[PDB]
Design a protein around this motif. Structure first.
Motif, PDB file in Angstrom:
ATOM      1  N   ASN A 115     -14.546  57.614-121.566  1.00  0.00           N
ATOM      2  CA  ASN A 115     -14.572  57.519-123.020  1.00  0.00           C
ATOM      3  C   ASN A 115     -14.395  58.921-123.624  1.00  0.00           C
ATOM      4  O   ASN A 115     -14.039  59.865-122.894  1.00  0.00           O
ATOM      5  CB  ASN A 115     -15.841  56.811-123.515  1.00  0.00           C
ATOM      6  CG  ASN A 115     -17.117  57.549-123.154  1.00  0.00           C
ATOM      7  OD1 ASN A 115     -17.113  58.751-122.911  1.00  0.00           O
ATOM      8  ND2 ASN A 115     -18.232  56.821-123.148  1.00  0.00           N
TER       9      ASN A 115
ATOM     10  N   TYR B 253     -16.446  60.991-124.545  1.00  0.00           N
ATOM     11  CA  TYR B 253     -17.580  61.856-124.246  1.00  0.00           C
ATOM     12  C   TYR B 253     -17.640  62.271-122.777  1.00  0.00           C
ATOM     13  O   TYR B 253     -17.952  63.420-122.467  1.00  0.00           O
ATOM     14  CB  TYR B 253     -18.892  61.142-124.576  1.00  0.00           C
ATOM     15  CG  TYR B 253     -18.997  60.602-125.984  1.00  0.00           C
ATOM     16  CD1 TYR B 253     -18.965  61.449-127.076  1.00  0.00           C
ATOM     17  CD2 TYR B 253     -19.184  59.245-126.210  1.00  0.00           C
ATOM     18  CE1 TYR B 253     -19.081  60.956-128.363  1.00  0.00           C
ATOM     19  CE2 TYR B 253     -19.294  58.740-127.495  1.00  0.00           C
ATOM     20  CZ  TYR B 253     -19.240  59.604-128.566  1.00  0.00           C
ATOM     21  OH  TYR B 253     -19.362  59.107-129.851  1.00  0.00           O
ATOM     22  N   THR B 254     -17.364  61.329-121.880  1.00  0.00           N
ATOM     23  CA  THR B 254     -17.623  61.541-120.452  1.00  0.00           C
ATOM     24  C   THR B 254     -16.645  60.806-119.553  1.00  0.00           C
ATOM     25  O   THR B 254     -15.941  59.886-119.991  1.00  0.00           O
ATOM     26  CB  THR B 254     -19.041  61.048-120.062  1.00  0.00           C
ATOM     27  OG1 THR B 254     -19.148  59.639-120.312  1.00  0.00           O
ATOM     28  CG2 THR B 254     -20.117  61.785-120.834  1.00  0.00           C
TER      29      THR B 254
ATOM     30  N   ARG C 239     -17.407  58.802-115.945  1.00  0.00           N
ATOM     31  CA  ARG C 239     -18.525  58.387-115.110  1.00  0.00           C
ATOM     32  C   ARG C 239     -18.017  57.498-113.985  1.00  0.00           C
ATOM     33  O   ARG C 239     -17.026  56.788-114.153  1.00  0.00           O
ATOM     34  CB  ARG C 239     -19.550  57.611-115.943  1.00  0.00           C
ATOM     35  CG  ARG C 239     -20.053  58.332-117.187  1.00  0.00           C
ATOM     36  CD  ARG C 239     -20.917  57.402-118.037  1.00  0.00           C
ATOM     37  NE  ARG C 239     -21.505  58.066-119.199  1.00  0.00           N
ATOM     38  CZ  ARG C 239     -22.811  58.235-119.387  1.00  0.00           C
ATOM     39  NH1 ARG C 239     -23.681  57.794-118.484  1.00  0.00           N
ATOM     40  NH2 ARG C 239     -23.254  58.843-120.480  1.00  0.00           N
TER      41      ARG C 239
HETATM   42 CL   LIG Z   1     -21.151  58.458-122.590  1.00  0.00          CL
END
Ligand SMILES: [Cl-]
Ligand SMILES: [Cl-]
Ligand SMILES: [Mg+2]
Ligand SMILES: [Mg+2]
Ligand code: NA
Ligand code: NA
Ligand code: NA
Length: 326
Positions: A285, A287-288, A290
């Motif tokens: 996303n 933001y990150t 994972r």
């Molecule tokens: Cl996140």
DNA sequence: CCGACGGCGCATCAGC
DNA sequence: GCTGATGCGCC
DNA sequence: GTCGG
């Protein structure tokens, strides 16, 4: 644009599926096929040839065969003649009116620009502004104007706090000669994934841009995302510039690379890259990135120190922004 | 066959 | 008021 | 509508 006729057809089909059918997976399928066809470096001679491209299947191949043979698609010829479809497709061109609102308006007998103007009381705030600038919002922004807008935003932001960094993303960062709107990523060291040490970080910037008459209207505004309207200043005796859409997104400073990856796009590139990530066992996303655990639950954020780190995780060769215009 | 298809911010509204 | 659903928007 | 398994 070796295959402009075909890609135009698929885009119109895509829009029909989104706006009228409300079939979002068909919409995405059509856009994916148009995109893969758009970058294919041969003039397509048959459906079969197109079907070798990923995203193009049996049905699109058929439509491509019809289009190459006749220069048109009966399916679209009929859609264009359908009053209800035509109305709905038109109303969705107003910012803030989607497929649902469009069908509702048509039901109430509101189906033209004239109808909209006389029923302003029936529009929400966003829709009212969308209508106000209907013509302006359909104009493209020349890169020269984007550069002028960049200078204003970067300079005003600096005046607010020298620690802000504003980055113009979207098609602009992908090197486009014209853009549909202005996309600005904002960071400030007081806002990280670990804490917000100052309130109103986005507000202060919006406020300053309003004060100098750059931002003229607001479509929506929260703590991390502003959606609005702006306008370059014009000189004495000079015709005014068109009003332009501007989006500002405040991203945690330590998550800049994921943020700038996201806001650079294109949208189709992001979908393609994120889907590839899932196939590789990762979720991305703004933001990150994972890992996905055996179950299906996202794990902890992986270290990212560059846009390229994100590509590495999913085993893709790095692609410069200019090569992400899918 | 058939499930999945990217991910999320803001506005609006229904239910409690 | 809050929470969750939905619409619409962004790339 | 297309793809993977
Ligand atoms: Cl996140
Ligand atoms: Cl669908
Ligand atoms: Mg843009
Ligand atoms: Mg866009
Ligand atoms: Na194919
Ligand atoms: Na719209
Ligand atoms: Na934008």
């Amino acid at each position: 644009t070796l295959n402009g006729g075909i890609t135009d057809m698929l885009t119109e089909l895509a829009n029909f599926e989104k706006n009228v059918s409300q079939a979002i997976h068909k919409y995405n399928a059509y856009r994916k096929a148009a995109s893969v066809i758009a970058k294919y470096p041969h003039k397509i001679k048959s459906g079969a040839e197109a079907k070798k491209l990923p995203g193009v299947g049996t049905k699109i191949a058929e439509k491509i065969d019809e289009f190459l043979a006749t220069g048109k698609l009966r399916k679209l010829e009929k859609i264009r003649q359908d009053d209800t479809s035509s109305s709905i497709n038109f109303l969705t061109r107003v910012s803030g009116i989607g497929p649902s609102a469009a069908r509702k308006f048509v039901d109430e007998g509101i189906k033209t620009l004239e109808d909209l103007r006389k029923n302003e009381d029936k529009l929400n705030h966003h829709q009212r502004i969308g209508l106000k600038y209907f013509g302006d919002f359909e104009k493209r922004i020349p890169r020269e104007e984007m550069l002028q807008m960049q200078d204003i935003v970067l300079n005003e932001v600096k005046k607010v706090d020298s620690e802000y960094i504003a980055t113009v993303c979207g098609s602009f960062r992908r090197g486009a000669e014209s853009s549909g709107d202005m996309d600005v990523l904002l960071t400030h060291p007081s806002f990280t994934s670990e804490s917000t040490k100052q309130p109103k970080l986005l507000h202060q910037v919006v406020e300053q841009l309003q004060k100098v008459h750059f931002i003229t209207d607001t479509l929506s505004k929260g703590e991390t995302k502003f959606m609005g309207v702006c306008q370059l200043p014009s000189k004495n005796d000079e015709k005014e510039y068109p009003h332009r859409r501007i989006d500002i997104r405040l991203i945690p400073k330590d998550q800049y690379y994921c943020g700038v990856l996201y806001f650079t796009g294109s949208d189709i590139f992001n979908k393609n890259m994120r889907a590839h990530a899932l196939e590789k066992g990762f979720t991305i996303n703004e933001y990150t990135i994972r890992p996905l655990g055996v179950t299906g639950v996202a794990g902890e954020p992986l270290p990212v120190d560059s846009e390229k780190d994100i590509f590495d995780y999913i085993q893709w060769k790095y692609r410069e922004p200019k090569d992400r215009s899918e």
